[PDB]
């Protein structure tokens, strides 16, 4: 469970616009 909680945090990042824009900019370079 302790490890499963972490993957839930990532789950939100990718549906958080603000976290997204930092994901995409991370790929641009």
């Amino acid at each position, epitope marked *: 469970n302790e490890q499963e909680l972490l993957e839930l945090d990532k789950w939100a990042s990718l549906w958080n616009w*603000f976290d997204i824009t930092n994901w*995409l*900019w991370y790929i641009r370079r």
Partner: antibody
Amino acid sequence: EVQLVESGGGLVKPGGSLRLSCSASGFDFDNAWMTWVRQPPGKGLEWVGRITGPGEGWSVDYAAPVEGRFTISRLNWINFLYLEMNNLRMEDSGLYFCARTGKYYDFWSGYPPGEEYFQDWGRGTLVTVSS
Amino acid sequence: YELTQETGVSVALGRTVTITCRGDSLRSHYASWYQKKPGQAPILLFYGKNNRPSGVPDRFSGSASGNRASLTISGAQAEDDAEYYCSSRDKSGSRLSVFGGGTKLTVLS
């Protein structure tokens, strides 16, 4: 076909409080980002605050000269946007709009968190303040 | 305090004119453009690199270069006598938003 009707504005003494309402129809409200913009008398538009959507946890960000007195909230069950104001001052008087906030991010040349544009605008409700 | 604009710009009927927005955040973020006639709701004109909303005439064109944004009207009409506001992020990397002084477009009579 998109309709936004602001109300709940009027006259109040300084230090008072007020609650504005903004209906919504013609688009999916429950997920839309929403923004409050005000136009003082004779001056231009001034961004107040914006409430995000479910992917963002309904988080809100406020303008600097405003943060601390106002609070924005939303009732998606009925498609209503609310702006409570406290410790009102003379500066706060002006026309108040609610605007459907869209989002832009050019992948190749954009910079986080991107930009925000205001698709639709209501006629707005006039606030006035006087001692 | 963040974004600057011209206050009073003019042009004759059928000519061309451009009004510009300026700010250190425009080096990193695009800007939106809105028309505002007194007693009428603002209207979104242009946003991002190239996005004109439907129902807008094609004569409106935007452009970005350095720390400046710019709106352009080709062959200005009488109905374009109005006020124009740019809008972007108050700072590079902020979650907020801001407007400029605004610009009155006088269709010269």
